Amino acid sequence: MAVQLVESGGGLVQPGGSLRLSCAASVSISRIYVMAWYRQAPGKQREVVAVIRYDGTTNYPDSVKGRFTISRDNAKNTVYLQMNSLKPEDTAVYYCNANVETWGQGTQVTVSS
């Protein structure tokens, strides 16, 4: 019953440039109420970067509006995050989150030469 989430993507890029992260679940995503992406920088606490509900209405924080985009894919159970214009401070470990309780394991993302 306990859903398992697995992430993919990550790694490193240059300042300016896009990337796409994927998060795959054990069941149909269309049953889950909310799903979300979270970001934890070294030396600080977690924070949200995108959420999406069962009806596909999404909320973004003001920090990353226009630069990120979250979407469900119903073909294979996978939620995508698209990161278009990157800054140097957007380097952290990223986590996938089901309803509230269940977490993923995270993927490291870094931006430099």
Contact positions vs another protein (CB under 8 A): 3, 27-28, 30-34, 36, 38, 46-48, 51, 54-55, 59, 61, 74, 97-101
Cβ pair 92, 111 in contact under 8 A: no
One of 31, 88, 99, 103 touching its own copies (CB under 8 A): 88
For the record, the structure tokens of 98 come out as: 């089901």
CA distance 98 to 85: 26
Please enumerate in sequence order all residues whose Cβ is within 8 A of that of 77, keeping only pairs 6 or more positions apart, or say none.
24, 25, 26, 27, 28, 29
Give whichever of 12 and 27 is closer to another protein, judged by the CB atom: 27
Task: From the list its own copies, another protein, none, pick the one residue 97 interacts with, judged by a Cβ distance below 5 to 8 Å according to partner type.
Answer: another protein
What are the residues binding its own copies (CB under 8 A)?
Answer: 11-12, 42-43, 88-89, 91, 108, 110, 112-113
